[PDB]
């Protein structure tokens, strides 16, 4: 089977600047009728892949003309003249010349932007969950940049690491930030055992962790 190699793996680009990514195929993609079945696709976060380029060099139906496909034979390049935030996502190449049809491993386009500290919010377990005998403490770290961030939990001042599960969003096109959720899950009896619960976020925008806490049974 034909191998489609994309490079680079990831690219970070400032809005208004150009972007170029490449796809190299292990076999020539020209066919016996002069046509090159080489497409480029964009997959935005949470969406299905969508058309950009086809026939190697042609703009697919409805696509903004900021996208340019070039190349022939085995070396192909996708160019974005000026990057907009909604261009973020994963770009794929695809070949239809040799059976079976194959996709590149994708290139993720990330938007470079000004650093931003997280908005941190902490939430005690709900009354309803406590009647269940389980107890989740949730902390959101919202709209920060860059994407690298650390969350630390404390219970009555002591760090806690078992029972923590984290989840990250993809970059947001509206503001080019990242967000993260962290959930600490306890039995109701252990939760009802201690008093103060603390979410600590460490990000490059500060030298001091952002700290959010609450006391059980205080509003």
């Amino acid at each position: 089977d034909v191998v489609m190699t994309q490079s680079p793996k990831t690219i970070s680009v400032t809005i208004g600047q150009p972007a170029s990514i490449s796809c190299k195929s292990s076999q020539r993609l020209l066919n016996s009728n002069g046509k090159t079945f080489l497409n480029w696709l964009l997959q935005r976060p949470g969406q299905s892949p969508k058309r950009l380029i086809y026939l190697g060099t042609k703009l697919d139906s409805g696509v903004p003309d900021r996208f340019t496909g070039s190349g022939s034979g085995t070396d192909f390049t996708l160019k974005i003249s000026r990057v907009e935030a909604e261009d973020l996502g994963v770009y794929y190449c695809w070949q239809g010349t040799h059976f079976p049809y194959t996709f590149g491993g994708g290139t993720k386009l990330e938007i470079k932007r000004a650093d931003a500290a997280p908005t941190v919010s902490i939430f005690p377990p709900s009354s309803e969950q406590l009647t269940s005998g389980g107890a989740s403490v949730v902390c959101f770290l919202n709209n920060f940049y860059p994407k690298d961030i650390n969350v630390k939990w404390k219970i009555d001042g002591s760090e806690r690491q078992n029972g923590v599960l984290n989840s990250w969003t993809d970059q947001d096109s509206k503001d080019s930030t990242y967000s993260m959720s962290s959930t600490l899950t306890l039995t109701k009896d252990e939760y009802e055992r201690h008093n103060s619960y603390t979410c600590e976020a460490t990000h490059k925008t500060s030298t001091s962790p952002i700290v959010k806490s609450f006391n059980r049974n205080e509003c």
């Binding site: 892949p49 239809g96 996709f103 509003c219």
Partner: protein, 222 residues
């Protein structure tokens, strides 16, 4: 223009079959197109599975050797995927996609349907309100949330105020543990508007036919 929509059972037991339907609107399936099945693995690798084209001729990836059947019903303008002998390695997002036979143009993909291959049981979620602590409500904005816990399989849908509240929302990818998922979502609004304008988490879990509409109540008197 042409639109594609996938349907089919989202949970399949190991060694049985996945069966999906793609319904095409805005174009006849007997004209011009190759109608493809493509799947995307949890890694995000895409794999071409096969097609049935406008005259009924088919092709499929040797990677699937013997397991795949692609068919159509012209009277209903639908084409179908059956994949037998499944294992957890077939857990993926399944897409239907039409491409023009002539030039590979006009690529049009359905919204994609997740298919989990697993023996684990279907479980409805508990939906818990995340109401802010008092001290964090005196700012200009306030963040509220919703915790959707212990369901299987994916997915659930979550909206705020029936989808009329969509700015300032973050819905996080579900995390799996012990054959149950947990998901959370935050919504941030101008603090002076709350609690005067109520906020409700609308969660649906189609696999268990369950829906929860949870109004977030402030901590403190309500």
């Amino acid at each position: 223009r042409v639109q594609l929509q996938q349907s089919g059972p989202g949970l399949v037991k190991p060694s049985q079959s996945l069966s999906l339907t793609c319904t095409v609107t805005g174009y006849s399936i007997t004209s011009d197109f190759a109608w493809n099945w493509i799947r995307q693995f949890p890694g995000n690798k895409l794999e071409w599975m096969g097609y049935i084209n406008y005259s009924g001729f088919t092709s499929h990836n040797p990677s699937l050797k013997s397991r795949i059947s692609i068919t159509r019903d012209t009277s209903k303008n639908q084409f179908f995927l059956q994949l037998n002998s499944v294992t957890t390695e077939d857990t993926a997002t399944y897409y239907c996609a039409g491409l023009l036979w002539y030039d590979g143009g006009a690529g049009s993909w359905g919204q994609g349907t997740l298919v989990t291959v697993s023996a684990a049981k279907t479980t409805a979620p508990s939906v818990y309100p995340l109401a802010p602590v008092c001290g964090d409500t005196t700012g200009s904005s306030v963040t509220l949330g919703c915790l959707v816990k212990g369901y299987f399989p994916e997915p659930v849908t979550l909206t705020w105020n029936s989808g009329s509240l969509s700015s300032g929302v973050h819905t996080f990818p579900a995390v799996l543990q012990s054959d149950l998922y947990t998901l959370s979502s935050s919504v941030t609004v101008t603090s002076s508007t709350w609690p005067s304008q109520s906020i409700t988490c609308n969660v649906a879990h189609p696999a268990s036919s369950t829906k929860v509409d949870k109004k977030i109540e402030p901590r403190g008197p309500t």
